[PDB]
Design a binder for this molecule. Sequence first.
Ligand SMILES: Cc1cc2nc3c(=O)[nH]c(=O)nc-3n(C[C@H](O)[C@H](O)[C@H](O)COP(=O)(O)OP(=O)(O)OC[C@H]3O[C@@H](n4cnc5c(N)ncnc54)[C@H](O)[C@@H]3O)c2cc1C
Length: 419
Amino acid sequence: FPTTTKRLMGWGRTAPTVASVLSTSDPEVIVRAVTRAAEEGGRGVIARGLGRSYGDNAQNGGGLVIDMPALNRIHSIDSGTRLVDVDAGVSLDQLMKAALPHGLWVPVLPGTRQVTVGGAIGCDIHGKNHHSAGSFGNHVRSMELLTANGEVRHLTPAGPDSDLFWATVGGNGLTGIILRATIEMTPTETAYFIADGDVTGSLDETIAFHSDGSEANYTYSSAWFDAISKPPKLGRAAISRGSLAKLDQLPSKLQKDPLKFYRKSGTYRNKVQNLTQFYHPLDMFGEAGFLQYQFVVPTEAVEEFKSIIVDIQRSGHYSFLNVFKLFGPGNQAPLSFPIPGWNVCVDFPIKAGLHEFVTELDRRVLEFGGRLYTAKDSRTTAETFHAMYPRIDEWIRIRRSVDPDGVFASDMARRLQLL
Ligand SMILES: Cc1cc2nc3c(=O)[nH]c(=O)nc-3n(C[C@H](O)[C@H](O)[C@H](O)COP(=O)(O)OP(=O)(O)OC[C@H]3O[C@@H](n4cnc5c(N)ncnc54)[C@H](O)[C@@H]3O)c2cc1C
């Protein structure tokens, strides 16, 4: 085993640990890494992708961490079936580039493309198109999961160990190492969006804006809101909504290569945009000076959702950067973050009182029927987490089925009692 010793941290740059990291482009060397741990039984193993998760789910202090990005080969891309067969360490960035010439679009994109296929599945990631496309797990056809008995299992969403499939989706790697997957891509005639922009003047307008049925006219939607001004301005937002452009909707110059790659206001229509124009401000979150916090509360819990936003602004913890989105229906994964409702990611300068205020937020999110997102948590308690996810015991049951001895472990699994 080629291993080096590395100090590791998540994107939040908090709670670093040291571990042994194995990188290899050979799946075989990883299967062997697993069996020598299913015998050693020290602190366990965890996969790590590109480490874009904020907290501590992709590290294992004094354990073994597998550097999955080294295992980044694309096996095949088929315009016909729309299927793409990929090592788990392939970037969505790498994948999008390889797939674009074939008229194929990564079906769920987060705000950064430096995420592996494996981490996308591990956190069941969502994008601006959640209300139309659900989360990344919804698009997975199969995965090969290396389990603690050193076996590589072929898993599918409906099929024999379907429950295992769904506990892996959003399982934060605690089910075993995903080595390879087949994703069903989205067909596109173009690499561009056609987008509408709008600005609201308050929280209540922001909410009404999302609640008229409008969202059905766009496959992609999100908003950046003001969380610093006092009502009536609190919650005013710049909304950006769009769908992938068809070839006949581009200007002729872009119609040349369609699969490539007055004051400017937040108000505009039928504007042609590429991915990075269209995805602002979602890309710029992690640039430990800042604590990110993301929650969703159910659609019906409107006054309760507004009350969170009101309290944030009263607290004096100022988040300049954020995101607001209305999620659509969730999937079958027991620990998948998204449920229908109001989703917000906020970004607070760390200072006296922050951690305590966010504990207060947790209790409210929890009280209102909502949850926190593991990809963005460095911080919450095991007890709150378990209460936010009513299917957690079911998931722990599956988890133990497949790793009775605790071969797969992370700092997060300890912190949140997932083992
Ligand atoms: C700037 C920025 C913007 C973001 N925007 C969004 C967004 O819009 N929506 C969203 O949902 N998320 C967003 N995220 C979160 C990010 O998409 C997730 O944290 C994703 O999991 C990170 O992928 P990664 O490859 O870096 O995984 P890591 O962070 O390295 O891993 C995260 C989890 O996946 C597991 N994992 C990784 N590889 C494997 C494998 N082969 N097998 C099993 N498990 C594995 C890990 O063990 C760990 O538990 C954002 C993050 C950043 C920094």
